[PDB]
Amino acid sequence: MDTKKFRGSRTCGGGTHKNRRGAGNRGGRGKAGGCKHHFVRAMMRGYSYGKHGFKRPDEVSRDVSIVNVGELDELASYLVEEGLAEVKDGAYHINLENLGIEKVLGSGRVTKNLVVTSEEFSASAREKIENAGGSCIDAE
């Protein structure tokens, strides 16, 4: 706190001088009392008692990097000028493997001919790419 502003206040913003003694003025140390007197506070701060679900091992579980077809479509020219994609007879050839993405999702619009090769596609990504005139290629 601003120590200088409280020089002369005696209690220094604490109320009574009998405040500010120990953990008794906080109701205990840490997040104690979450079943008894900090029960509602535990609900508010998310520390309510209980267990839920199970964790799978990190060595089998995996998350996939994603990119929506709108993001690919409306910055594909930047990808070609940066080298990560090429234009073959007018069709953008994007390989998500060198982008670090493994699943194409279907959010957005596809306005150009995208020939996209990726480890996985959502169904909607499939229709949006194929209706734009392009195709989807799985990574063997």
Partner RNA sequence: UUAUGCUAUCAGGUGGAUGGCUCGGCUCAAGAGCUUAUGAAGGACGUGCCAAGCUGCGAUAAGCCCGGGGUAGGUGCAUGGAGCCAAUGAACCCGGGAUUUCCGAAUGGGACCUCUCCGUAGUGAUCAUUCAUGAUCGGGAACGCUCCGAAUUGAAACAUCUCAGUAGGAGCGGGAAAAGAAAUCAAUUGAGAUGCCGUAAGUAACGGCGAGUGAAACCGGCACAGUUCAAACCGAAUCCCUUCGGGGACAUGUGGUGUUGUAGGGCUGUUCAAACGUCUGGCGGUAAAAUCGAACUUGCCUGGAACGGCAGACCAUAGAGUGUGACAGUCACUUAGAUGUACGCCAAAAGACCGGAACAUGUCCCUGAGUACCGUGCGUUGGAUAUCGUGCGUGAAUCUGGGGGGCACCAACCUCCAAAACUAAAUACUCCUUGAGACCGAUAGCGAAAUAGUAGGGUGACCGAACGCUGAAAAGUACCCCGAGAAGGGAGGUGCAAAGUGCCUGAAACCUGAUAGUGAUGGAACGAUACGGCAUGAAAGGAUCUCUGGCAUGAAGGA
Partner RNA sequence: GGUGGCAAUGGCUAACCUUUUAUCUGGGCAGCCGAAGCGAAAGCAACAUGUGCGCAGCCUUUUGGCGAGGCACGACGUAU
Between 12 and 99, name the residue whose CB sits nearer to RNA.
99
Between 35 and 40, name the residue whose CB sits nearer to RNA.
35
Shortest approach of RNA to residue 135 CB, angstroms? 17
Between 24 and 89, name the residue whose CB sits nearer to RNA.
24
- Footprint of RNA (CB under 7 A): 23-24, 27-37, 47, 49-59, 61, 64-66, 68, 70-71, 74-75, 78, 103, 105-109, 120, 122-125
β-bridge mates for residue 105, sequence order: 68
Between 66 and 91, name the residue whose CB sits nearer to RNA.
66
Shortest approach of RNA to residue 95 CB, angstroms? 17
Strands (E), 52-125: 66-68, 85-88, 91-95, 103-105, 114-118, 120-121
Spatial distance between the Cα atoms of 11 and 48, rounded to a whole number of angstroms: 35
β-bridge mates for residue 103, sequence order: 66, 120
Shortest approach of RNA to residue 72 CB, angstroms? 8
Q: How far is CA 26 from CA 22, 31, 33, 101, 134, in A?
A: 7, 10, 10, 48, 64
